[PDB]
Design a binder for this molecule. Structure first.
Ligand code: BZ0
Ligand code: BZ0
Ligand code: BZ0
Ligand code: BZ0
Ligand code: CL
Ligand code: CL
Ligand code: CL
Ligand code: CL
Lengths: 297, 290, 297, 290
């Protein structure tokens, strides 16, 4: 027949299996707080910073109602939030099959629900990835332990020439972060994925697909950014200390969704005033109130 | 006489919202385990095996899922709800039939204790068949708590809940031992909240309150703020990683109290075998820890 | 008679009096480590990032030999380091009287020896301040406790219109950080300063002087930067945790002077190899060695 | 018999360079006070007032400036140098004339201890007039230390310094009590370094080594890395800020041992009056701390 561009977001905030049991037995990792807010506020704030307003949250059946209770339909923050369940954790690239109907014919963005980013001109780094309407965009960050991640190899010109998932002998220390930008080809790339030996559909196979077509942009997220680790109990604790230090220093919050919707002009002063009221007695609501007065450059 | 325990893990209101908007504080981890493991481990260390967990209606199912009926750790867990947050002393009205004609002990679900000879320090409270024991602890901010005042001879002469002008820096901790009188004292309480400090004052007036000092060489950790939640997890991380030993591991404590045997400990470590907690429980079977 | 532009740096790493006694009784604050290196490496690294190679370190008479033992004459790192003593702490603006001969007819830069900065495109933020050959440049950063600092007030257009030192009622939450860029007028501005009521020559009077002549640029250092606090034992501990978290995450060091001189091309591979050798057994020397191999973007 | 003390605060080589390039580790603060205050406070808590500080030649003047002759805190401090880092047992050759015919105790200048009833735990070692006492502590990484092996009955049967295959996870801590034999045992040692574990093995072979367990409810903190230095300061910050009480404050401990009086404590707090440490010492004059 005959047919005659915006970008949707997906947050994968599914099962971390038993790795962090028993800490995570009664509740999933992405609802645990990092200092003063739930973990999912951070990657959600990241999507919002990319200008993305229509967002699918993928979680386990057990925990979806709790994600729904925390976040609603998004209307309070100028967003539209929908929900989908992942019955079993079959790999990150399942997000695109699970989210196939949500995505439709649009461009998309995947963020892991346990990743947090901090640093200056992050809005602008996401802007270039979001503005690119063709191909895929990922970010490479220097890490101590690249063997844990998808690793990107660069030629002497600085061109990305290979990707490898958890290599025993990394070709560089540049890990692919858990924020991915995709055009309309990804659902089709995802549907042709064959499981890997450990029973998972690998995002690195999706990104390699783009690489082999010449449509993978790999931007460096520099060392002046913090891409923090929530993979261990220890790293979770370091992520909370990190955010506490920045917030207590500056009197500004990292990854406050109310604030970000306010600054984007997705909600207005009066709506922000309403969101503050039920939290007026604690520091978070008193912080939302203070935003109405102050110019923050 | 057998002593029954109660963990009160009720609501903290909106004070830590949005961090606790999704789920109650006592289910969140402190470092490597759910917060409630810590006060539970305290009761177990006092020899207490029959225990009532009281939480909000929304969250009981989840305490219940986490901990079950206790039988896997040689405990006998029961559960009950606190519909609204109307004071710690409701624990004894909600827990009345559970307690029966027995001695009891109440620990708050968010209190963490650490230190040497804690088993002994709780032994002396536990073995008192008569009266009540509580613990006083020096703190920077006594206004936040029940404050005990002492005479020059070291005798408790008043308790005050959240006084504007604390009489001392001694704060009553969230661990309480009681005889058969506490239910009836709980039942005649009048709202101020139904205050645990009124329960303890009732025993004080009758010369039946033992106020033992919990010395400066014990850790009574603060989980009342986001900052103090953090310091607590850092505090436990430092101890566990220095020693290769875990703080408030119920499976280990059951095993050491001989409430479960080596074969049961082995089955418990099986599901967790690929991570550090299972590896740890496996390592306990063949190492002597003094 | 008849006469016929580079920028020199000064690090003020003098007396913190008795405020941090007894921690600082046997040694000055600026030699205490922040995680894995001495505190003075951080502000020194900041000057180096601004392209500054000729640097005066001002310390107490008691501690100069220890600053000299740590840092030498700078030749090992492609720098020229000189030393001057401050017999009594009479205020930060004394740096210009103490450093009058060192400065000569050049432009200058003052950094406090206990300030540390982290964040992306810091090189570029310093570049604009350093390239400005006229007037003064300072940086304003949002803090929880502006009452502790020099506070900058902005009009609705975002123009700086006043400065106040430790105001009881701050006009904004924007504090002036401890990095200052100056033209050839500063030594003369400094020499006319009259002590303040508490017996100190105030840098805020110097900056107000520039403001009243229309030659103070106040650039915002955004919230995506960390300007960390070493004013208390607590904040010192948070600064060390902060740097440990970033360094252990990335496998890169913050404020490694050897690395920065290497990357600037002030020293070469073989010199860096020599600086590594006496530290080869510890993580710091093994890190200097690894830099010779790897491309870090 | 009077027992004299030695703090060994010698060189850590280049291991923490460049952080310690400027000055030795034991002069750096842990949170709010210089590291050496902590092992010093340990000796004081054991009743030890006559103390020899041994440090590198470069740094002695500065230990000497920091601490003086001790008289202001009711101590009697002396000082001596360790020219090179040739093993902890040199402490007894360097300290030989200082020790004389007396009993002695050696603490490493970078060891931190915390916990309840520490005064008592050191009392039982201190009061032994014969033989040597050391402390064993469970740790994750016993290879880094002197490792003690026990028989099924809990008796020490071997000590090994930094074994490649530790026999247990029990590590000997950096606090050692000795009788009059240690100098002569130190003097017959042969370089392996002159090893403190050889000194302790000499007493073991003669049935004269008391190996007491320092339980899991005590903190023996690690200052051997940059990471463990940090965890230690965080650990002390959390205790001091929770309690409003300081850990290892020599002035306070002198005052409580009645080695200095209220008027002396008052003069000590005067120079520090504008900061928290002086304010703290002033606050100790009019508060009862149990
Ligand atoms: N840039 C901001 C902002 N600022 C904005 O989102 C913003 C939005 C529109 C215009 C200007 C600034 C904020 O309010 N909170 C915040 O954490 N950041 C940093 C951030 C945001 C999301 C994820 C990681 C870091
Ligand atoms: N004392 C123990 C023990 N020891 C025991 O449970 C025990 C009990 C009876 C006999 C032998 C060991 C332990 O295994 N785990 C633990 O965390 N502690 C300390 C502790 C226990 C509860 C709360 C805070 C600290
Ligand atoms: N930008 C760098 C760099 N990179 C450089 O200095 C550099 C120098 C010349 C060209 C490219 C990069 C570094 O090596 N270490 C470092 O801590 N930073 C960040 C930094 C440097 C100084 C003060 C605060 C943060
Ligand atoms: N026990 C005390 C005390 N208590 C005393 O010194 C003391 C000694 C004799 C009688 C009464 C109190 C103190 O004041 N400060 C302190 O840090 N402690 C614990 C301690 C002391 C040294 C090292 C590690 C922990
Ligand atoms: Cl960067
Ligand atoms: Cl104690
Ligand atoms: Cl920014
Ligand atoms: Cl113990």
């Amino acid at each position: 027949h005959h047919h005659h561009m915006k970008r949707k977001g997906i947050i994968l905030a599914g099962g971390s299996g038993t790795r962090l049991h028993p800490a995570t037995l009664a509740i999933s990792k992405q609802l645990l707080p990092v200092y003063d807010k739930p973990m999912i506020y951070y990657p959600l704030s990241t999507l919002m910073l990319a200008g993305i307003r229509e967002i699918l949250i993928i979680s386990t059946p057990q925990d979806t109602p709790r994600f729904q209770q925390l976040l609603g339909d998004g209307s309070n923050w100028g967003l539209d939030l929908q929900y989908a369940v992942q019955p079993s954790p079959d790999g990150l690239a399942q997000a695109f099959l699970i989210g196939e109907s949500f995505i439709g014919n649009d461009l998309s963005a995947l963020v892991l629900g346990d990743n947090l980013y901090y640093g200056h001109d992050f809005h602008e780094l996401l802007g270039s990835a979001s503005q690119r309407q063709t191909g895929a965009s990922v970010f490479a960050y220097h890490v101590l332990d690249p063997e844990r991640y998808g690793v990107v190899e660069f030629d002497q010109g600085g061109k990305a020439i290979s990707l490898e998932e958890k290599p025993l002998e990394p070709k560089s220390n540049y890990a692919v972060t858990g924020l991915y930008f995709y055009d309309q080809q990804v659902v089709d790339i995802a549907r042709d994925l064959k499981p890997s030996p450990r029973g998972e559909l690998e995002i690195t196979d999706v990104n390699r697909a783009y690489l082999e077509r010449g449509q993978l942009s790999v931007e460096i997220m520099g060392r002046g950014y913090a891409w923090l680790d929530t993979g261990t109990h220890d790293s979770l604790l370091e992520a909370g200390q990190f955010i506490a230090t920045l917030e207590n220093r500056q009197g500004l919050k990292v990854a406050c969704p109310e604030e970000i919707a306010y600054r984007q002009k997705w909600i207005d002063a009066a709506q922000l005033e309403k969101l503050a009221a039920p939290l007026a007695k604690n520091g978070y609501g008193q912080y939302l109130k203070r935003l109405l007065t102050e110019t923050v450059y």
